[PDB]
Amino acid sequence: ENMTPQDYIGHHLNNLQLDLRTFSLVDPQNPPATFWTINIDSMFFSVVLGLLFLVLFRSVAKKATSGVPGKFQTAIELVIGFVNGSVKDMYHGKSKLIAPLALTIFVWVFLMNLMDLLPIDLLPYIAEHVLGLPALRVVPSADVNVTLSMALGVFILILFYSIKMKGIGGFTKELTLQPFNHWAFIPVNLILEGVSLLSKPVSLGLRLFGNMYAGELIFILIAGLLPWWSQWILNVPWAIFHILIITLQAFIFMVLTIVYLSMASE
Amino acid sequence: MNLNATILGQAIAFVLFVLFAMKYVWPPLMAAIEKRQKEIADGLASAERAHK
Amino acid sequence: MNLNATILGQAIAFVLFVLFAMKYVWPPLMAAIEKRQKEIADGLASAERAHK
Amino acid sequence: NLNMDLLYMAAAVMMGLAAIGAAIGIGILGGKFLEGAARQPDLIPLLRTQFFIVMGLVDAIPMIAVGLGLYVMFAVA
Amino acid sequence: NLNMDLLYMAAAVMMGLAAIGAAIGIGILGGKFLEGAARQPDLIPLLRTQFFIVMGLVDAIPMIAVGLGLYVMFAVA
Amino acid sequence: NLNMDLLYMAAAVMMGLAAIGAAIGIGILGGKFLEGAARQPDLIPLLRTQFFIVMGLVDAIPMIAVGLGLYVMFAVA
Amino acid sequence: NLNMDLLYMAAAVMMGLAAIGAAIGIGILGGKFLEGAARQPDLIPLLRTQFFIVMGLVDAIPMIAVGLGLYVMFAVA
Amino acid sequence: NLNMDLLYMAAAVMMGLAAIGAAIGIGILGGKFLEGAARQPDLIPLLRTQFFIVMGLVDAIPMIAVGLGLYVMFAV
Amino acid sequence: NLNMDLLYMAAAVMMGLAAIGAAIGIGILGGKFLEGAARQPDLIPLLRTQFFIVMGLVDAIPMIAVGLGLYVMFAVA
Amino acid sequence: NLNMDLLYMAAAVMMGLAAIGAAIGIGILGGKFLEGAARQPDLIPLLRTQFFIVMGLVDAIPMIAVGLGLYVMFAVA
Amino acid sequence: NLNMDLLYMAAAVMMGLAAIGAAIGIGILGGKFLEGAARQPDLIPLLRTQFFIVMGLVDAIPMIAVGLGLYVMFAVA
Amino acid sequence: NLNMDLLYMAAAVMMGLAAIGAAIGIGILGGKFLEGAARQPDLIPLLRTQFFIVMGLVDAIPMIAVGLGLYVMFAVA
Amino acid sequence: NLNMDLLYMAAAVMMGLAAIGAAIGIGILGGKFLEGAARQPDLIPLLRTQFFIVMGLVDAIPMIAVGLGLYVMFAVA
Amino acid sequence: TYHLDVVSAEQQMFSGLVEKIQVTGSEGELGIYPGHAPLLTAIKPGMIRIVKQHGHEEFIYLSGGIL
């Protein structure tokens, strides 16, 4: 196999993509430039993990014993109480969306991130030497598109709640008066309170991206740049550490969302 | 890196998983949790009334 | 480069990783689930005796 | 070649300064979190939430910087 | 050509300094807020208010800089 | 000719350093303000006054520097 | 190129460092001022007078560099 | 040729600034941790847990930078 | 010509570094002075005396730095 | 050739910063270890244990940078 | 030409850093001299003595640097 | 040729940063050591011991920096 | 020969950086000395002893740097 | 557990074995667990929470004092 590691890593950093306009698969040297060229492998695992989440939770919703819970029921209701406690700590309104939104974000992002702990070459080995397709990298959250989709969704929700709960007459009031509160300063505030509101969601996405993307890259490097008999001594001290990341990077994504929504409406 | 039409292809899958989780996952579970909580607390209320 | 050897090393590392996992990370979760079960069982039984 | 080398230095500066900022800010904040936890252990849960709130503000601009750095390093490349 | 090349370095330095400043200032302010909260848990809702007030000032100047950085990266290009 | 790019560079330098100074100074000052508020929670309107008094003074030179960096970037360059 | 852009750069350097110094020094001083004021909620004028004294000292030497920066902005260039 | 040393310098900048950030941040955090442990020596195992939590964020950006550093040092 | 247009950068560095040094050192010293004044108000003039006493030692070096910078700007360049 | 200039320059700037990080980072830690021991020295052997536990984390990145610097200086020549 | 440019830049740094180290180093020390004085003014002279012993060391390595700066400008041309 | 000049420059950078690190680290550590003795003189036997134990770790890396700076200056240059 | 001039930049940085640290490293240390003296003034000489011990460590690396800072500008030159 | 005394100038108020306590020191709230480092402070008028070993909780009102 004629892989110089510098090119092996480059191959590892390529997605598998499809032409919305022409219904064709992307190439190792060839990409259809037009943006309408869906990243396909992450969509499959993404929707797959959302499916597995909803499945595992409905399969206990329709078995829930209010007596002594089964060992499996206990963990799902544990995570439910965890999320509920966080929500009712940070939020106080009557909106019924906040709690399930938070649970979806938490568990979905957690399972997405957890993918990276798998050995890096295995599924790329299968998806080429069985299915023949040219490329595969599996961590859904390790791509800007998905995290920005979530971030812009949360931004739309933020705008929805800020409009609904205090009206345009108050929304324009916050956007113009604070911080310096006099009309001569409204033109300046209109800048800051804007970019601020824009940074809230954008950073939210990038925070999740940058951690995971580089968190994947390390493993790639460890594979491409060390002999077999040594890789473990630098793979293991990283992998365990990454367990501490994938959790927090999920948890934060949950909490900040609540913190924004509760902060927007109230 | 490559800003891509996937930015939309994800958002769809997002708003779906939120709603089926909302209407058909969360109330079913929280109802059972609150049921067990209330029906454990009712025993404490019964003990208080027994003393009273 | 010997790609097969790189998968060799990946598998060695993953075996050591799963060792660390199933001998430091999982017992906490199982003990937490068991603690929850004990808690709910004792709550329901103590609430039962209140009725008598 | 002639044009596409300096870009890596440009991104390196962004990521280095963002790393210093985020690291030192979150350290300064976590130090007071641990001091508070040490004065009143029972408040560890409550204070912890107030940490993740305020910490969410700390690393905003550093993460904007990191995102644009990765863009320059892989979108322009 | 340099009118094209060096602008990414120009944006890089702006974004790095904005990141450092915002992160460090917000970290100090949040640390003092956390320790005040740990010493007075009932004043949490009051102090938090002032926090978002005074932080609204701290975050002013950096968001100018970062903004112009983006303009230099993509508008003037 | 190349002349103009280093004006973007100069604006970047001046504005980033002005952001550093303004953010960190207001961070320290607001941290001390919150420390004061946490102890005497009824005196918040008095201190909030005095804070604002000094609040404008720290960021005088940063304001000047940001103004002149806007001058250099948009008026000159 | 070699003539004027370097003058703009020198002015940027002068004013950026002046901003750093003035902002951080007056932030420290004002933090101590607010601490003392919260400790003594009746001596606000007696202390703010001393604050204005020592702050008049502090701001001065940055203002030298700021005036010279304006000179290089509009009298050399 | 003229590319390699310039790329090595671009990598060295990232490595150095990441070291600065990680060291100073964890030093501050560990200082506060130790002054906490000397106060409530029986709750060391509790406070230490919190430390390992917050450390996971302090080392968030550095390990990004270090990662990309190695990339520039070996992948281009 | 560059032989003179470039020395303005030496002047700018030489005096901006002195600007930040003097400002921050005097800020620290004055902050300790103000805390002293706040704790024991019927002491103010004596602490003011000692404050000026050592403030002179603080500004000793920045003053020669600024003088040499002005000389290099006007007389030399 | 030209390479063996910068191949050393880089190795310096990486290992110099890696020093500033490792030294100061430990000092800030070591101080808090001493002030705790200087109150109730009966805990010296306990706290010293925790000290090393945390110090190993401090030298995580600095020693990585030192290793890369040694690789650049010796192996890359 | 350039032979007699660099030596002036070499002065700007040498006297610049030497200023900062001198300005901050004393700005710290004198601060404590004030604090210990404010707590016990009846002890001022003895402290005032010890200060000058310590101070004379701090200004040692900075002043020589400034000297080597003046030399490097005038006698080294 | 140019090699030795920038080799000296690299060693200079390396040793300046190493000196910064060692100085400030041992300074911050010794400050707390000088506080401990005052609180509990009579254990000085002991705090000085622990202070040396910590100083060794503080200086571990700057020593490598100086070692390699000398290695360059007097084996490579 | 360009070789003649670059050395002055290699020395001027070292004797600058070694000045910033060796000053501040002592400025911090002496601080904790004075506030130690002001508490237990009967022990001033004893503390002085330890101070002169600890200072001898702080100046370890700086006196090396300044040494070579001379060696470069006079012996290599 | 540790031994706790609540003593007035006139008569003693509590002498049990305790597992932790919580007070409002002059500089903020404050919680004492076993093995706490030696400490001295004033406490403001208000309640103090004792938990006797076996977990029995009670509240004592204090008009101030020194802890």
Side-chain angles (χ1 to χ4, degrees), chain A, chain B, chain C, chain D, chain E, chain F residues 1-58 60-77, chain G, chain H, chain I, chain J, chain K, chain L, chain M, chain N:
Chain A
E1 170 61 342
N2 195 240
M3 284 293 99
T4 58
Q6 312 182 16
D7 195 37
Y8 161 81
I9 288 161
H11 293 292
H12 253 286
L13 283 167
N14 294 339
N15 287 352
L16 178 65
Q17 289 147 252
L18 168 62
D19 210 351
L20 280 165
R21 281 311 166 106
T22 81
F23 285 76
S24 171
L25 274 183
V26 80
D27 189 305
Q29 53 268 207
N30 320 321
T34 313
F35 33 132
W36 311 85
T37 43
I38 314 186
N39 291 0
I40 284 185
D41 35 357
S42 73
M43 272 308 338
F44 163 105
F45 283 91
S46 163
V47 296
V48 162
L49 297 177
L51 262 45
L52 188 138
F53 159 50
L54 281 169
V55 163
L56 264 50
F57 278 56
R58 194 75 152 135
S59 188
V60 169
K62 290 190 168 177
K63 280 200 76 194
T65 71
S66 75
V68 173
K71 212 162 200 173
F72 179 51
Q73 306 189 336
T74 308
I76 283 151
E77 67 172 285
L78 263 166
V79 60
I80 289 283
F82 178 94
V83 174
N84 183 30
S86 308
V87 174
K88 227 176 67 66
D89 289 338
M90 269 163 274
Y91 179 62
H92 307 297
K94 289 190 176 184
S95 184
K96 289 99 76 171
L97 168 60
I98 310 298
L101 172 59
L103 175 67
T104 64
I105 296 168
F106 181 63
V107 186
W108 198 17
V109 175
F110 174 75
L111 285 177
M112 285 193 285
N113 301 353
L114 178 65
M115 289 275 109
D116 196 18
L117 276 296
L118 304 178
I120 190 64
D121 274 311
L122 196 89
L123 306 195
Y125 190 102
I126 286 163
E128 185 156 39
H129 309 301
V130 171
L131 303 174
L133 298 176
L136 189 85
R137 52 184 285 262
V138 295
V139 178
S141 48
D143 282 311
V144 67
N145 295 294
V146 317
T147 71
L148 270 187
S149 196
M150 297 207 80
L152 296 176
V154 180
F155 183 25
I156 287 159
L157 266 54
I158 286 161
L159 286 163
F160 160 83
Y161 277 101
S162 53
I163 281 286
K164 180 180 174 183
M165 294 273 182
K166 58 202 175 195
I168 187 66
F171 183 27
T172 51
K173 203 171 180 180
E174 295 187 357
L175 265 57
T176 51
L177 305 193
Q178 293 140 36
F180 306 122
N181 304 341
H182 307 296
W183 77 105
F185 304 96
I186 290 174
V188 187
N189 305 343
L190 274 168
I191 301 164
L192 302 181
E193 297 300 312
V195 278
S196 175
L197 177 60
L198 268 56
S199 100
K200 283 166 133 65
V202 173
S203 60
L204 207 178
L206 296 166
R207 177 181 300 108
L208 174 57
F209 168 66
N211 280 283
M212 290 299 139
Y213 178 82
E216 178 167 51
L217 182 56
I218 292 295
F219 284 110
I220 292 168
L221 289 162
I222 291 294
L225 294 167
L226 283 175
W228 66 272
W229 54 271
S230 72
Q231 299 196 359
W232 63 275
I233 185 151
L234 288 164
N235 181 299
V236 163
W238 183 239
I240 55 146
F241 176 93
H242 210 60
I243 315 194
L244 183 53
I245 303 305
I246 65 177
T247 45
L248 294 174
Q249 291 298 325
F251 181 85
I252 294 167
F253 200 125
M254 171 177 75
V255 173
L256 263 57
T257 303
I258 300 162
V259 167
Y260 290 142
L261 292 173
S262 176
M263 182 209 306
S265 58
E266 306 183 9
Chain B
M1 298 168 50
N2 183 235
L3 273 160
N4 184 285
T6 302
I7 195 170
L8 181 67
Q10 179 70 10
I12 305 307
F14 183 30
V15 72
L16 301 193
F17 296 143
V18 167
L19 295 177
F20 287 3
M22 181 215 288
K23 306 196 82 176
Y24 304 131
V25 176
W26 181 271
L29 294 161
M30 272 304 298
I33 290 164
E34 289 294 342
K35 186 164 61 190
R36 175 165 45 235
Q37 294 299 156
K38 165 178 155 56
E39 299 176 1
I40 283 170
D42 58 353
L44 321 182
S46 278
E48 177 267 21
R49 265 215 291 94
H51 214 310
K52 272 214 151 214
Chain C
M1 80 185 199
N2 191 335
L3 178 135
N4 192 39
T6 73
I7 296 160
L8 206 181
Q10 289 170 65
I12 296 164
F14 186 75
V15 166
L16 271 72
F17 164 80
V18 178
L19 257 160
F20 181 86
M22 303 301 182
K23 88 192 183 170
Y24 291 97
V25 179
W26 183 66
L29 297 191
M30 89 186 303
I33 288 161
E34 287 174 10
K35 178 170 177 175
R36 256 285 180 173
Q37 279 195 318
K38 180 56 172 163
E39 172 183 42
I40 280 163
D42 289 2
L44 290 172
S46 101
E48 277 172 355
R49 296 146 205 208
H51 312 126
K52 55 152 312 312
Chain D
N1 298 24
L2 181 62
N3 311 116
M4 310 298 279
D5 48 8
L6 192 283
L7 305 185
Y8 289 93
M9 186 70 73
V13 172
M14 302 185 60
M15 313 207 86
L17 297 197
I20 284 181
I24 297 188
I26 297 176
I28 288 172
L29 186 61
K32 300 306 190 304
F33 164 50
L34 265 57
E35 166 174 4
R39 293 188 78 272
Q40 201 168 159
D42 298 36
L43 294 186
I44 279 163
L46 175 58
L47 295 172
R48 201 199 295 123
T49 66
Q50 302 303 148
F51 177 70
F52 292 116
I53 287 161
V54 179
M55 170 268 158
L57 281 66
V58 166
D59 75 3
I61 310 302
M63 287 300 205
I64 298 303
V66 160
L68 275 84
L70 283 158
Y71 169 91
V72 169
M73 188 154 160
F74 289 103
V76 185
Chain E
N1 291 45
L2 275 81
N3 311 92
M4 309 168 64
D5 182 0
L6 278 296
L7 303 194
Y8 296 126
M9 182 62 70
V13 69
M14 298 186 78
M15 297 189 81
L17 296 175
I20 284 174
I24 299 295
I26 298 167
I28 293 168
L29 180 70
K32 287 296 201 292
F33 156 71
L34 290 185
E35 66 117 273
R39 289 169 190 273
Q40 303 289 7
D42 44 319
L43 306 181
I44 272 172
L46 169 60
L47 291 163
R48 189 190 301 126
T49 301
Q50 308 311 308
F51 175 69
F52 289 123
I53 292 289
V54 186
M55 191 282 305
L57 280 49
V58 173
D59 206 12
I61 311 307
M63 279 184 171
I64 302 303
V66 81
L68 271 157
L70 267 56
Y71 194 82
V72 172
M73 272 207 71
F74 306 132
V76 312
Chain F
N1 301 30
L2 285 81
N3 45 39
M4 185 176 292
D5 70 82
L6 283 136
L7 279 52
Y8 299 102
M9 198 70 205
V13 170
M14 174 163 43
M15 189 163 297
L17 297 174
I20 295 280
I24 292 185
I26 306 163
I28 290 162
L29 176 65
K32 281 299 210 287
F33 163 64
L34 296 180
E35 171 171 25
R39 282 192 167 81
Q40 315 298 347
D42 55 308
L43 308 186
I44 60 189
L46 201 183
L47 293 168
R48 189 172 41 238
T49 306
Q50 307 313 126
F51 168 58
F52 290 140
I53 290 296
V54 51
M55 191 272 138
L57 315 190
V58 288
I61 313 307
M63 285 270 206
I64 288 170
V66 172
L68 299 174
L70 291 165
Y71 198 110
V72 171
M73 212 197 78
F74 278 130
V76 190
Chain G
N1 47 5
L2 295 172
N3 195 352
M4 309 307 188
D5 50 35
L6 285 164
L7 309 180
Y8 271 113
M9 182 67 68
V13 170
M14 286 179 169
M15 295 184 281
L17 296 183
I20 289 288
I24 289 186
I26 301 303
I28 294 161
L29 185 82
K32 294 303 206 299
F33 163 51
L34 295 183
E35 168 61 4
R39 178 167 285 95
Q40 299 281 25
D42 307 315
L43 307 181
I44 295 104
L46 175 63
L47 283 161
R48 87 189 189 183
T49 47
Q50 317 301 311
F51 159 89
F52 281 114
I53 292 289
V54 301
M55 174 256 285
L57 281 185
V58 173
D59 289 345
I61 179 160
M63 277 176 175
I64 302 304
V66 172
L68 202 67
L70 289 169
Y71 170 88
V72 179
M73 267 291 294
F74 303 126
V76 186
Chain H
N1 67 349
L2 272 148
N3 185 203
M4 296 296 106
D5 47 38
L6 181 60
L7 258 53
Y8 284 113
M9 192 75 174
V13 169
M14 305 184 83
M15 228 66 56
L17 295 169
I20 291 292
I24 303 305
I26 293 189
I28 293 167
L29 174 69
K32 282 300 201 286
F33 168 67
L34 295 190
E35 66 152 281
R39 189 192 179 106
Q40 303 249 36
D42 280 13
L43 307 191
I44 289 173
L46 171 56
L47 299 181
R48 199 206 302 126
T49 302
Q50 309 313 133
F51 169 82
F52 289 134
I53 296 305
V54 66
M55 167 185 79
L57 308 189
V58 176
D59 292 6
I61 315 307
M63 304 310 287
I64 299 182
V66 166
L68 264 61
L70 288 169
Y71 176 87
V72 180
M73 185 158 165
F74 292 97
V76 54
Chain I
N1 186 292
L2 189 66
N3 60 15
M4 287 174 279
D5 299 326
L6 186 49
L7 296 170
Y8 290 92
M9 205 61 62
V13 166
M14 188 188 294
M15 81 168 57
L17 297 176
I20 64 176
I24 293 175
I26 302 287
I28 298 159
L29 187 78
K32 284 301 206 288
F33 163 43
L34 296 191
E35 182 58 21
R39 278 178 61 267
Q40 308 214 104
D42 328 319
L43 195 52
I44 290 163
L46 183 57
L47 304 181
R48 199 198 296 135
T49 305
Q50 308 314 132
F51 165 81
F52 292 126
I53 287 284
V54 298
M55 171 271 293
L57 279 69
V58 174
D59 289 345
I61 311 301
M63 286 290 200
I64 56 175
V66 175
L68 288 160
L70 286 165
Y71 142 76
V72 168
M73 198 200 71
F74 285 115
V76 183
Chain J
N1 67 354
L2 54 97
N3 305 139
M4 299 213 176
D5 304 341
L6 275 294
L7 286 173
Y8 284 100
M9 178 77 264
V13 60
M14 164 154 42
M15 278 187 279
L17 293 167
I20 287 182
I24 302 178
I26 293 172
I28 297 166
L29 176 72
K32 290 300 198 293
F33 162 67
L34 298 192
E35 92 160 13
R39 267 164 36 238
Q40 47 171 349
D42 308 350
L43 300 188
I44 283 166
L46 173 64
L47 298 179
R48 199 199 297 122
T49 305
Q50 308 309 135
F51 172 70
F52 298 131
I53 287 283
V54 301
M55 181 272 298
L57 280 298
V58 175
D59 286 357
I61 314 308
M63 297 191 63
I64 287 167
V66 167
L68 295 191
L70 289 179
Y71 181 86
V72 173
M73 192 163 88
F74 287 72
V76 185
Chain K
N1 293 4
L2 291 176
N3 183 29
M4 292 299 169
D5 161 44
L6 213 77
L7 295 170
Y8 293 82
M9 194 73 235
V13 313
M14 196 154 187
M15 301 190 306
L17 305 192
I20 285 161
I24 300 300
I26 292 193
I28 293 158
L29 181 63
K32 293 296 185 173
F33 168 64
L34 286 163
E35 173 61 17
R39 293 165 74 254
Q40 306 185 29
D42 53 17
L43 195 52
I44 281 173
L46 178 49
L47 299 181
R48 198 207 311 124
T49 303
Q50 297 308 142
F51 166 89
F52 289 118
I53 291 180
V54 177
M55 184 286 300
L57 296 152
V58 171
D59 283 27
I61 179 167
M63 274 188 163
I64 67 186
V66 178
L68 283 159
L70 270 42
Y71 169 69
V72 165
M73 264 219 291
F74 304 136
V76 186
Chain L
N1 64 356
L2 298 170
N3 295 150
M4 50 234 66
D5 305 320
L6 303 188
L7 284 168
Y8 283 120
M9 177 62 75
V13 156
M14 203 160 180
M15 296 187 74
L17 300 189
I20 290 282
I24 307 308
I26 302 295
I28 291 177
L29 180 69
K32 290 297 200 291
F33 163 63
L34 297 193
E35 104 166 24
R39 159 178 311 254
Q40 278 189 175
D42 290 16
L43 274 205
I44 322 181
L46 174 57
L47 298 186
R48 192 209 302 128
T49 298
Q50 299 301 156
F51 163 86
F52 295 135
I53 303 312
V54 178
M55 167 270 293
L57 289 156
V58 173
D59 304 345
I61 299 300
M63 295 287 214
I64 294 166
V66 168
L68 304 183
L70 300 176
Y71 190 108
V72 165
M73 277 188 68
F74 298 124
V76 192
Chain M
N1 304 356
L2 278 57
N3 169 228
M4 185 170 74
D5 43 278
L6 262 290
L7 305 185
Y8 288 88
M9 213 72 194
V13 67
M14 288 192 296
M15 287 187 283
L17 288 173
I20 276 186
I24 299 175
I26 303 303
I28 293 162
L29 177 68
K32 295 309 197 294
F33 163 78
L34 297 184
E35 64 153 44
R39 278 178 174 71
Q40 306 240 66
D42 47 330
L43 305 177
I44 290 175
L46 171 55
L47 304 190
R48 264 205 279 92
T49 303
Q50 313 315 129
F51 168 94
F52 291 129
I53 286 164
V54 172
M55 183 254 302
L57 272 46
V58 174
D59 291 334
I61 312 304
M63 297 314 198
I64 295 172
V66 173
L68 302 179
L70 264 46
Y71 189 97
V72 166
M73 202 164 72
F74 290 92
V76 183
Chain N
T1 54
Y2 52 83
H3 192 230
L4 169 68
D5 303 328
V6 182
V7 178
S8 175
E10 306 193 347
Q11 94 298 13
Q12 178 151 11
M13 304 164 65
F14 186 91
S15 204
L17 269 290
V18 168
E19 65 180 2
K20 59 188 174 86
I21 75 183
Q22 172 174 9
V23 287
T24 60
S26 90
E27 295 301 319
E29 290 229 3
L30 165 64
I32 320 301
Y33 274 67
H36 193 295
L39 163 145
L40 220 190
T41 186
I43 68 184
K44 295 199 299 177
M47 216 69 63
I48 167 175
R49 284 179 58 255
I50 327 296
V51 283
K52 297 173 160 185
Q53 104 286 24
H54 314 299
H56 308 293
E57 178 176 41
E58 71 201 74
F59 288 47
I60 300 183
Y61 185 89
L62 300 182
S63 311
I66 281 174
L67 169 135

